[PDB]
């Protein structure tokens, strides 16, 4: 089993598709292990550039294929560095981009704290004949100024994990388990700009809402409830592109159904309002009167479905 | 005949384009067979990389092409191994990405349930050149937990079948027959997005509708239902996004037009009620008495079209 | 000039962007030709797979690139396949995926008609060279189901033609003259979509410009009719996203522009109306009374704008 | 300075990206010039293939590198070819898309008239040491049938021009400058999909602006005109997404921008009607009149920003 | 420590993804070294193209990888020059594309003044093993006039930094710091698109929400109200697909939440005017003769939020 230690510096993160939980992840990666000893032109060591470790490779060169687990496709690798030493290691420099998939948990879309992972493994070579011996991740290039859509907070976990694998018992009997190493950098999503342009305005149609009922005759009052509805049909077709679509339901979903509650209540009561006349000549008050209980009532509605 | 047993684990399937009917799976495919015996350094197996199975292929060995047949363009192949034993057999690791096609059928939009198919063949080699003997696909990494857009249901279903060709019979007289490989993972839609988000307010819309007739005048009900269409054409633009085009409708657009013929059946009314004046002086009883009537018959008929 | 023998098996057609007039197809092609005969090992075919046909044609063995016509860009290839006989003749066997050009005709965008065209011309050698025997395409796997957004009606009609070239003329003086295959398959468009979303509510908001003209005063028809605008402007958004852009003008459009100069007919007749008052007291009978009359008329223009 | 013919065959021209001001061409490149004389096998040209070309210029092969001076990337070249003459001269022909990009000048969007610009020059090879002879370029395969979104006015122009370059004197003393072909393919845009679907609904719009005053009291003029916006604001994001952007204003933008300073002049001068009440009990005559006056004058308005 | 001279022709920048804060350069790069002095045929220098330069890398000639530190993914590069000199100096030329990033400060959207910055580092070489000379950037080919959405102020400031790294700290002891090339070009985006398109109009919204105010009863004034909001709300899901997400908030956005809190302005002062009645008797004089007050009381409040 040689001895592999793994630096991976992660040069900056961005691109996070919401809508199929991949986020693009730029960095260099190095390999660090030792072999046998070889013979260099002088003690400087040698470096083998891009399009030239291959015919190392094919030589008879032994380099591991460290592939990604959670990577999307292959990743769109750039330049691969080998510097083989006199004393007998051998270090592989490379420049990754990938698109990188993980578990992410949309529970509050706004205030979101999910962890971007990347998952490294051998390919080939499993834990008898590849051990990663310890991972340094510089997560230093990274660094939130108050303008980066997601706050990257603290430093970066590293694990050494050792997986076995199902689909290689029928190939390899006892030795189908690979080492493997994951790096979670825990991220929370900026909130500023849904607070300031998806919840507010939500705020306001509701106080809208409430103050729909000041109208002291019936049928203007459900002309407006009907303008009002357009208004948050218009406003929920807003907001229906920046989110993914999961079983439960997001804060600016759950501010959105208040909104059509609202509004429907609005109906109910402007409805059973003219319904109170048991003759037709009994005025409302005591339920026209619902322009102070039902806003507070709706706010500890709103709190609730806030918390 | 050479016996070859393929196991595939599918890693993750996403990315279900519902307008082109393909899905992206990512995962691995490893293929066993057995040839001619050969000399290996030692009694460890030969492993041999990605960028090095080629200059082998060139050499002289044996690997097959085993390709997808329902794939869109070819398969974004990530690192490839091959490991020769000394035994006799070759095991052949390939890491795979591909955008597969299906005849997905999207009879109940919100509530489908569909099949992601892959369909592995030999490219060139026949029944009597390459036999496939079994497949076991370890769906494992593959579990919902109710946050997944698709829960995948039970396990994957194998099935090797024997297909004959029409186009390769000019070229092959009674030998243009291949092996095929069709694996089958039943996968339910999760409803409840579109139930707690595209239904609902076509409940409360339809509810509206309902709820239009309570005006006791003509005018302002004729200018109350043009403000409502108005919202059925906002709402109806709404939702225009994300589901595919199909001969039949599907659930949401019947829930469409069926808002649209509530909205049209309360302007027939309403020019009748109207028009039932036959000398000017009648008054609308009988018909202005359908808040009642018409909202749990139109219950019924969408009981009848979510049905 | 040498025989080849073509076979294009046509797997699937999708992906047809009527905004750039391409459409991506997926299959196989088959080339048969004769050559000098040569030794196998044994009487078995030998058969050449991709990645090692190239080291062939480096050798000098003769494959021709049959190039297509009316593609974009290069096509994404899969496996290709040589099988050298014996015999003395030459099978190569490709997979090819292509996003082609036509010159679509949107005459009747929901009705319409097309043919899908592949064209196939070898690329440098012309027809003294090579010459195209025969093809027979295999349109098999094409099936329509009533599901499928294009109905593939009938067979695939195949042709051979010889196509001279005027650029051509000034590095071959008399032979720049190539052999080529056009294969067209007749698709029509399945317009049930069009038909139950798109068009149907442009009968209903047509028929409700028919109906705001039941309103007794004028100042409450002019804002119904202005209502009415913003539904036509809204439901004029909707759809402006499914269809290519033409100098004349699609079923779809002539809709719209007609509810458009039904909505200003509306404006026009209220205005003409409210001054056909001479001295501000004569009332409003003849012209008031197109609530029969106009619906008719309308319903014979958009006879015209549908036939 | 070696002669070089070139000839450049435009299959077809489509893709403008208004937005990027790039543009995607097709089509063949064939360049001619004469070298040293060679032995070939018989008075046969020799022709050697894609994935061949490449092991004749390893060998010793000079084949200029001609390349797109205005392209966006690489262009995905196809098949490449080249003739090899027992005369002497050699033919490399080659097909090319490329995404072109051009300072398109977006005066009048829907009657726009640009030139789409191909700009061709050798990578390395200057003036004394490759020189273009003449070019013809083959714009046949382009033709306008009054279905094309662009009409490609006459023949292409050609045109031989030497450039020098600031960058390459530090690195060549005397000889940086090189030779260039520029080819002009001038195209006016198909303005009959924008005059009869986005000019037409703002006259409709603008005359409903200018009806809007034969109401009789300024509340529901106020409501009116406040729909109105509404009308124009919807409209005003109905072609939001067809057009570049621009520091100057397209003629669609005039009119949004005429339509606005319409409902806003209405908006004016109703509020000022209400406000020439000096005591309460004057009437609006003169400033109500404008029913026939304010509608001339915004058509000279409207000739003035078409025009 | 091998001189090297850079020398980058910026072509042209365009394609400032401001979602992503990516933009795309266009460009070469041409590298001047002195080696060891080689024998040449005759006096003229040896010109290596593009799939040539890499049989020269093999055979052991140095060329050195130039990476790119701010590049997403791989430049996809075009052709490649190598002039080999008798005197002993190599010159590299190179033509690329890049993806590059930046932290882009959207402080004032319309008003934005940014640099796009190249960063250009070799990959493997540190400063005792190649160290940058000098570099001057040729930035000739850009130039505005006035059409271009971003105008390009000044030259390009080039400066030639010495960066160490953490992470290669384990693997060189002592030498682990690299030489450093930054190209800044500050670049100021053209605002007369945005201030004659997205500015403007809620200029006039905002004064109609100022004449919202002029209506003598209050239940039409509410029903205006709510109509404003649906205005404001449309133009609100306008402009939802030009500009990122920042914490802090776009001069767009504070005119859109200017808008949301005026028209509230008007909803809590016409419910507080309807509210002063303190018997129902007295008449609302002083709060309702703010159509002079609070209109220039909120172009006081427009011009804090645009300063």
């Given at each position: 089993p040689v001895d592999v230690s793994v630096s991976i510096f992660i040069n900056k993160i961005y691109g996070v598709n919401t809508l199929e939980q991949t986020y693009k992840v730029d960095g260099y990666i190095v390999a660090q292990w030792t072999g046998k000893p070889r013979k260099t032109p002088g003690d400087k060591p040698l470096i083998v550039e891009n399009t030239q470790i291959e015919r190392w490779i094919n030589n008879g060169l032994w380099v591991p294929a460290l592939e990604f687990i959670n990577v999307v496709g292959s990743p769109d690798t750039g330049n691969k560095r080998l510097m083989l030493f006199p004393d007998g290691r051998v270090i592989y420099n490379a420049r990754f981009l990938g698109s990188f998939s993980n578990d992410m948990d949309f529970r509050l879309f706004p205030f979101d704290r999910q962890q971007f992972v990347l998952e490294l493994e051998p390919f080939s070579y499993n834990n008898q004949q590849l051990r990663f011996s310890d991972i340094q991740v510089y997560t230093e290039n990274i660094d939130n100024?108050?303008?980066?859509?997601w706050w990257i907070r603290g430093k970066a976990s590293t694990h050494i994990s050792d997986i076995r694998y199902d689909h290689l018992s029928s190939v390899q009997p006892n030795q189908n388990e690979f080492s493997r190493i994951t790096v979670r950098i825990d991220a929370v999503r900026n909130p500023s700009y849904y607070l300031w342009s998806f919840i507010l305005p939500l705020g306001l149609i509701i106080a809208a809402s409430w103050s729909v009922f000041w109208l002291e005759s019936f049928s203007e009052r459900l002309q407006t409830s009907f303008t009002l509805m357009l208004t948050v049909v218009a406003y929920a077709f807003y907001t229906s592109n920046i989110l993914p679509r999961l079983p439960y339901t997001t804060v600016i979903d759950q501010m959105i159904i208040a909104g059509y509650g609202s509004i429907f209540a609005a109906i109910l009561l402007i409805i059973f309002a003219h319904h109170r006349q048991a003759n037709g000549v009994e005025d409302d008050l005591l339920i026209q009167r619902c322009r102070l209980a039902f806003p507070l009532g709706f706010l500890a509605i709103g709190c609730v479905l806030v918390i």
């Open positions: 100024e108050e303008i980066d859509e």
